[PDB]
Design a protein around this ligand. Structure first.
Ligand SMILES: *[C@@H]1O[C@H](CO[C@H]2O[C@@H](C)[C@@H](O)[C@@H](O)[C@@H]2O)[C@@H](O[C@@H]2O[C@H](CO)[C@@H](O[C@@H]3O[C@H](CO)[C@@H](O)[C@H](O[C@H]4O[C@H](CO)[C@@H](O[C@@H]5O[C@H](CO)[C@@H](O[C@H]6O[C@H](CO)[C@H](OS(=O)(=O)O)[C@H](O)[C@H]6NC(C)=O)[C@H](O)[C@H]5NC(C)=O)[C@H](O)[C@@H]4O)[C@@H]3O)[C@H](O)[C@H]2NC(C)=O)[C@H](O)[C@H]1NC(C)=O
Ligand SMILES: *[C@@H]1O[C@H](CO)[C@@H](O[C@@H]2O[C@H](CO)[C@@H](O[C@@H]3O[C@H](CO[C@H]4O[C@H](CO)[C@@H](O)[C@H](O)[C@@H]4O)[C@@H](O)[C@H](O[C@H]4O[C@H](CO)[C@@H](O)[C@H](O)[C@@H]4O[C@H]4O[C@H](CO)[C@@H](O)[C@H](O)[C@@H]4O)[C@@H]3O)[C@H](O)[C@H]2NC(C)=O)[C@H](O)[C@H]1NC(C)=O
Ligand SMILES: *[C@@H]1O[C@H](CO)[C@@H](O[C@@H]2O[C@H](CO)[C@@H](O[C@@H]3O[C@H](CO[C@H]4O[C@H](CO)[C@@H](O)[C@H](O)[C@@H]4O)[C@@H](O)[C@H](O[C@H]4O[C@H](CO)[C@@H](O)[C@H](O)[C@@H]4O[C@H]4O[C@H](CO)[C@@H](O)[C@H](O)[C@@H]4O)[C@@H]3O)[C@H](O)[C@H]2NC(C)=O)[C@H](O)[C@H]1NC(C)=O
Ligand SMILES: *[C@@H]1O[C@H](CO)[C@@H](O[C@@H]2O[C@H](CO)[C@@H](O[C@@H]3O[C@H](CO[C@H]4O[C@H](CO)[C@@H](O)[C@H](O)[C@@H]4O)[C@@H](O)[C@H](O[C@H]4O[C@H](CO)[C@@H](O)[C@H](O)[C@@H]4O[C@H]4O[C@H](CO)[C@@H](O)[C@H](O)[C@@H]4O)[C@@H]3O)[C@H](O)[C@H]2NC(C)=O)[C@H](O)[C@H]1NC(C)=O
Ligand SMILES: *[C@@H]1O[C@H](CO)[C@@H](O[C@@H]2O[C@H](CO)[C@@H](O[C@@H]3O[C@H](CO[C@H]4O[C@H](CO)[C@@H](O)[C@H](O)[C@@H]4O)[C@@H](O)[C@H](O[C@H]4O[C@H](CO)[C@@H](O)[C@H](O)[C@@H]4O[C@H]4O[C@H](CO)[C@@H](O)[C@H](O)[C@@H]4O)[C@@H]3O)[C@H](O)[C@H]2NC(C)=O)[C@H](O)[C@H]1NC(C)=O
Ligand SMILES: CC(=O)N[C@H]1[C@H]([C@H](O)[C@H](O)CO)O[C@@](O)(C(=O)O)C[C@@H]1O
Ligand SMILES: CC(=O)N[C@H]1[C@H]([C@H](O)[C@H](O)CO)O[C@@](O)(C(=O)O)C[C@@H]1O
Ligand SMILES: CC(=O)N[C@H]1[C@H]([C@H](O)[C@H](O)CO)O[C@@](O)(C(=O)O)C[C@@H]1O
Ligand SMILES: CC(=O)N[C@H]1[C@H]([C@H](O)[C@H](O)CO)O[C@@](O)(C(=O)O)C[C@@H]1O
Ligand SMILES: *[C@@H]1O[C@H](CO)[C@@H](O)[C@H](O)[C@H]1NC(C)=O
Ligand SMILES: *[C@@H]1O[C@H](CO)[C@@H](O)[C@H](O)[C@H]1NC(C)=O
Ligand SMILES: [Ca+2]
Ligand SMILES: [Ca+2]
Ligand SMILES: [Ca+2]
Ligand SMILES: [Ca+2]
Lengths: 388, 388, 388, 388
């Protein structure tokens, strides 16, 4: 067994093709299914696994009432082969209300965060053993990715932040070998706020598109040099802009360097990735609510301040259905490495009031160089049939 | 690990012996079992797996209401070891309302089709990764086998069609190596309509008996030359005729070359395979409804226009119980390769009105050169005990 | 991987020690558990599996009503690691209302019997593939062991009978290599009726203690010569006598050669095994009903006509609780091969009338050369808490 | 595969970091979860498994009524990967109302005890086979660890006791190779009563901190010489004292040699381990009830009679929530071997009267040399939502 070094060209893609859907909410109205949120999928070298933070309860269970809250001591990271839903025989890999897992070629790495908001501890579990831990540096909710970390040659890097949600915060990128933190680098460059990074191997680096929860509608870019541990950061040039709230494409802007200050506050985890000077990306279809999801290529989106020429758009969840968080994940192919993404469909409170729980389900698509058609693949549950 | 090349004689068979039954509908009245239809079983070199398209819900779940529909975005391909039923811990291998999976010696191939009827996309998942995709060529429901594809020396072939259901349609046979489409051949020869092929290794070719949904009660034969990618097609000579609707054996005909035009429209997936000049086959016992299932050898059935001398018949599901789709699957034996088949028993709407769901269960038999007796092995559920 | 040849001394045993209990009936009042009967456990070279014939339904399911019947088309052989109960994710290995499985060192062999009582077919599934089949020779319920077959050097032998239940019947011992029947030997020697053999490796032979359902309270002994395929048969000498109905030890007899004709008709599957001139055995504690279960050594029980000196008795299920079938299974130890047994605890109709189902649970003990104490380990379900 | 010899330094630890929580009671109000108590986790060389004694029933099942009792014939040892809860597909490894499992590098060892209180039998199951058994020496509840045994170079040692609960009792330490008892040593040194040892590898020995159920609030220390089979025993020096009932730190004492006689009677399984002259330990936060759980280092706690200087304390379950038994488990790390612990959170009767069952759930932490924060991770179930 050898370490993953990811040195293969990114595959050229034409757009995305359907890959998986687990249908957890339709099934919960006739089965015992875990209540979850912040899902993600990561992939070892032979097969793919889906993950999620559970709320320590199943949906048709009175303990699902008020699961809107993001942090309780009972949240654990659930892990299953991609496609098998979170039934009662699923494994709780660790205690966590914030996580990031990745496989380095030889074993899985899970960083799990639980604890008091003001004094959280992050555990680094590697190959089944606890190998290290870190406590909260700014005493205000130590958080992380909520999607995959990425390892090159034995070192896995994860980006975490502690500080204000909508204010200045402290961000450090950690480099860890076999579960042991081997270096910590503070954020550098121009990003003003960084939360939930969606990171991906871009040999010899790793690149992350994150959430700016303070001043931007455009998303931050964090660049990690795996050899010097140097960090660099900017914003995505695309004038099209992927966070929610966002302005609307007529009036939206990005200059590649600062927060655009257009409906800056709040956000949603998202992804985007480069292809030459172009950008492939997804965002919700609504500019105000987390509804619908669409992906497209922005010609010039990676390199020209404000480029808004779009092409190859695809609807993934129509605008009348709910979406949520989304992230990227890379699968190594035979000749190139491909990029795929998952989009969390959340259901329940606060937006839907008939029930007292909050849960999600997932749908995931992978890049393709072939051809494809059209569709909309939403959650599917009829809220009127659900246990409340 | 090496590629399956299937070069071994077909085993001589005497008839079929019982092999598996999963009992999914009896169990659904006291367990959480997936709602499914279009089942099939395929087999890797060490063990056999059963598959089916689920309706993204379990039976005792309000979302099972109106599952009569064949295509919704929530259908996924379910996969389990043959014999373990589709309980909540089953894996949804991909998104699909039409599929075909096969194992080439080294990994599984799944072609999954989802999307808009007018603009569907077929994904080629090989060894866990998405490796290729194709969009709809005639903009009218891209569909495929619904049973096993077959691979020889590394190339797997699947036959798909897009076009009218009962009208002229476009059929292409795709050759794919490691998930990547390496050639596409249009249908050739005399078949007029080809849907749902039941294909099997017949070294160095592959032969398929399909469904003619427009003008025939006799079934099409598609012959694929794995070396030139040439396609040839005809109809099965047997005057006995396996599609449903069918005429009745007194008045039924087939001339090996054209649709017989006897109750042509509509059909049901079926199988049949050759043995010298003889034909082994199964069809429903009713000539109008999908009820009962029987298998037999037709002396001369493969080679003489209209041969109707039957022998070795076996009832598999008596004529008072429901059957459905059926297909073939080959298992490599020690000295010869054997042929087996599965018969889908559907239950629910539209035929049975007490409940609002539609689901199936399966029973599967394998060829045998030994001896056997008689029986009838139907679904078994008492419709009056079912959740509605 | 090599073939099991069982050539190691039988371990000297002092009595039996507790080994497993699966608690299927207590659990069925709060879980979806398969309805089953005729359980048995067999063991491959690394681990042990428990088996049973299911009634194609779970207990809290309306289809469990009237499961008293021994043969319906929906019965399948269930198989799980010893100790995990038959939950909905269990595998139905084959269709069968009568079975026998064994592992020959390299793969499992399952002989499964389904079909019409007057024309049943037995399938020989080996290593996942159907490899052979046989039809009913006397047209009257082809039946077999209901416990483990045993293989030595590649050949597995099973004993089957077809004929009257309580009358003269036809018994053949089949020798099968890799799933293929390689020889069939008719019964020889003095046994008058042979049903349900409990067989065990006794290098270079196999010895079986069976059920005489016509004229005996003493149990038949069938001896198979694996090298000439010769069969020999007698009755167990012990005057103590293990079938139920039985007379009572004061008035019971056995002369090692003929049925004792003491409450001959009917019976129950049982086991017994030799140790020098002694006999280790188990029987129900009642001489009329299948209640309680006790094991003991009968000094001289193997060799002296009528020996009744008992020693080392152990109660396994007290006389106020229900028991059922019981059988033997051998596990190869490090220096000797040990003998273990399972005892089926049945519940439900006809004896208990509150519920309409019939099911069992199991408890299993293994030989030991150490020390042990006392106990009673019954089913445990309170019939008043059960779903009816 | 080679035998575990545990010869690596203990890792230096700073305190404990969160490791797993299975949430079995919240889940039981919406799923079929086993009723259990006396949990523990043990770990083979690649991964960790959690264990527990089940009460042969699930919680939402009428058979859970009155599960307060510690010994019934239906209790079995359950075993799963750490983190997957005891759902219906869990394996009952053996019959037992008292257990101890450990992995010696090459296979698991399970000592299981069932039987009559006055005449219990302990089975030694090794690598799937029963290999030995022992009967009760003092005819009064043969009991054992209820947490992991530990093996060095092929020999596993377990400590068992038979005798009075609160009175003089007989304790023997057994040494077993491959499931076979190879030597038995009676307790020696100064401990007066020894129950439930929490033992750990301390090359070349094994050290155990146990429960003194007769005369002490301070816990016994048992030292096993793996080379001479010599036993030595004392009490933990720490004046802080970990059993419950206990006096309170102002008035508590320990002189390293005798029971302190401060609220001696009764107890609770616990752990503690040495680090130079210091002691790491956990105890309940209440000195009277099993509520809350806290861990800390006692400077001088291992070597100075009565040392009470505490430092590094951590709350694990706040004082307003229930805790229970706790034990230690060692995981071999890359350069040193680490120590981890589990704390059983019990719920139900007798303390909580709304329901009629008694069950537990677990939370587990592992040592860490890094940093950490604060939290409280209790069971979580709202007793008013539970099935009764
Ligand atoms: C968890 O477990 C516990 C304990 O578990 C064990 O419990 C049982 C269930 C076992 O089976 C095990 O499986 C289990 O593990 C449970 O707790 C128990 O729950 C019981 C109820 O479920 C409760 O009540 C008991 O239950 C027993 C069986 O369930 C009964 O036998 C018992 O009563 C018996 O004796 C009674 C004597 O009076 C008798 O009463 C009859 O009724 C009338 C009442 O009006 C008597 O007299 C009146 O009669 C007429 C009118 O009809 C005249 O009226 S009038 O005055 O003129 O107007 C009479 O004059 C008047 N009498 C006067 C004035 O004196 C009548 O005479 C009686 N009949 C006779 C023939 O005597 C009754 O029929 C029974 O025979 C009682 O019901 C248990 O106490 C309770 N135990 C504990 C420790 O809690 C838990 O419930 C479960 N539950 C859960 C959820 O876990
Ligand atoms: C079957 O399935 C296939 C695959 O899904 C599908 O094809 C894809 O269709 C989409 C939708 O049309 C294509 O994406 C669009 O691409 C155009 C750009 O392409 C045109 O122009 C360039 C040069 O500019 C030419 O080279 C090219 O040949 C085309 O002529 C974009 O402009 C589209 O974006 C606009 O439209 C979206 C809605 O479709 C808006 O939401 C978006 O905001 C953009 O609108 C803005 O700009 C417009 C002017 O530029 C303006 O008019 C609006 O008001 C607004 O300001 C979109 O990206 C995609 O590329 C196709 N993919 C491929 C591989 O062919 C089939 O359509 C489908 N058919 C059916 C029946 O289902
Ligand atoms: C125990 O189990 C065994 C195995 O299942 C079973 O044996 C099988 O029985 C079936 C049913 O009889 C056999 O199949 C029939 O085969 C005949 C042909 O065989 C006869 O004729 C040939 C020469 O022609 C001889 O060589 C041979 O020895 C036989 O004499 C077919 O004719 C049968 O088909 C007709 O009957 C069917 C119903 O059985 C109809 O549904 C079908 O439509 C056919 O009918 C048409 O033709 C008839 C004249 O040809 C006419 O009379 C009708 O009106 C109609 O027009 C059928 O294929 C099978 O081969 C046996 N298998 C083996 C290996 O022996 C036992 O019967 C079973 N016994 C019991 C008690 O359960
Ligand atoms: C703790 O746990 C241990 C292990 O379970 C247990 O020890 C076992 O006890 C049983 C029950 O006593 C023992 O089995 C009995 O063995 C005697 C024979 O042994 C005696 O005699 C021989 C010579 O004959 C001596 O060598 C030997 O030392 C003994 O003195 C059998 O006779 C017993 O069978 C009779 O009793 C049964 C009930 O116990 C009846 O059901 C059975 O039908 C037999 O009765 C018939 O014969 C009797 C005269 O022979 C007559 O009196 C009756 O009316 C009837 O006609 C039985 O097999 C077993 O060997 C012990 N095992 C070991 C390894 O020691 C402890 O007893 C247990 N203690 C407690 C308190 O739980
Ligand atoms: C964020 O998370 C971190 C990690 O959890 C946490 O840090 C830890 O805090 C705890 C609680 O304070 C620390 O443990 C205490 O340690 C002191 C000893 O340390 C002091 O004194 C020594 C020399 O004596 C100095 O070297 C050292 O620098 C400190 O000044 C203990 O005394 C504490 O025990 C007493 O307090 C407990 C409650 O905290 C009592 O329950 C216990 O019974 C002890 O009380 C008794 O003695 C007292 C006098 O000694 C007396 O006043 C009482 O009345 C009573 O008689 C305790 O062990 C731990 O070491 C810290 N860990 C690390 C790695 O730093 C942060 O506090 C946390 N912050 C927030 C906001 O959440
Ligand atoms: C650790 C934690 O609470 N993370 C939460 C984050 C933070 O609130 C934002 O990043 C602001 O910092 O976002 C969510 O609330 C959200 O957008 O739905 C969900 C997530 O659980
Ligand atoms: C992709 C799709 O809809 N396939 C469906 C096909 C087509 O309708 C026919 O092939 C006509 O083209 O047949 C069914 O309707 C049927 O016979 O029960 C089921 C199946 O789901
Ligand atoms: C194949 C079959 O029906 N086997 C059944 C046998 C036969 O009836 C007897 O062997 C008489 O032949 O015994 C049972 O009825 C019984 O004793 O409970 C159960 C079993 O299912
Ligand atoms: C074998 C057995 O009954 N063990 C039990 C022990 C003993 O009672 C004590 O060790 C006194 O000997 O402790 C418990 O009761 C307890 O503390 O909750 C639980 C456990 O099941
Ligand atoms: C088919 O494969 C087998 C097994 O690898 C090989 O021995 C045989 O020669 C091959 N035959 C052909 C015609 O490819
Ligand atoms: C312990 O085991 C390791 C791994 O096999 C070995 O290298 C080491 O030398 C052993 N040490 C002792 C003291 O047995
Ligand atoms: Ca924002
Ligand atoms: Ca037709
Ligand atoms: Ca009899
Ligand atoms: Ca005490």
């Amino acid at each position: 067994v050898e370490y993953r070094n990811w040195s293969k060209p990114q595959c050229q893609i034409t757009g995305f093709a359907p890959f998986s859907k687990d249908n957890s909410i339709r099934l919960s109205a006739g089965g015992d299914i875990w209540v979850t949120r912040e899902p993600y999928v990561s992939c070892d070298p032979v097969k793919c696994y889906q993950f999620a933070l559970g709320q320590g309860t199943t949906l048709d269970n009175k303990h699902s009432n008020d699961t809107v809250h993001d942090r309780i001591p009972h949240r654990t990271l659930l892990m299953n082969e991609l496609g098998v839903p979170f039934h009662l025989g699923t494994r709780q890999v660790c205690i966590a209300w914030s996580s990031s897992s990745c496989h380095d070629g030889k074993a899985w790495l899970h960083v799990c965060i639980t604890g008091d908001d003001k004094n959280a501890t992050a555990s680094f579990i590697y190959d089944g053993r606890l190998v290290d831990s870190i406590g909260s540096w700014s005493q205000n909710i130590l958080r992380t990715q909520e999607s995959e970390c990425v390892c090159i040659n034995g070192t896995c890097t994860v980006v975490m932040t502690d500080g204000s949600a909508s204010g200045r915060a402290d961000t450090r990128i950690l480099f860890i070998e076999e579960g042991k933190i081997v270096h910590i680098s503070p954020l550098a460059g121009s990003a003003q706020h960084v939360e939930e990074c969606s990171c991906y191997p871009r040999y010899p680096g790793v690149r992350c598109i994150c959430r700016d929860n303070w001043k931007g509608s455009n998303r931050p870019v964090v660049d990690i040099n795996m050899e010097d541990y140097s960090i660099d950061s900017s914003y995505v040039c695309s004038g099209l802009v992927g966070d929610t709230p966002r302005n609307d494409d007529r009036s939206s802007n990005s200059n590649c360097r600062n927060p655009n200050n257009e409906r800056g506050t709040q956000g949603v985890k998202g992804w985007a990735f480069d292809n030459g000077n172009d950008l492939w990306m997804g965002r919700t279809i609504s500019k105000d609510l987390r509804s619908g999801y669409e992906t497209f290529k922005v010609i010039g989106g990676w390199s020209t301040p404000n480029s808004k020429s779009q092409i190859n758009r695809q609807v993934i969840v129509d605008s009348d259905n709910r979406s949520g968080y989304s992230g990227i994940f890379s699968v190594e192919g035979k000749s190139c490495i491909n990029r795929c993404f998952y989009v969390e469909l959340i259901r329940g409170r606060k937006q839907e009031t008939r029930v007292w729980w909050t849960s999600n389900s997932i749908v995931v698509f992978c890049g393709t160089s072939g051809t494809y058609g059209t569709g909309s693949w939403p959650d599917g549950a009829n809220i009127n049939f659900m246990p409340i």
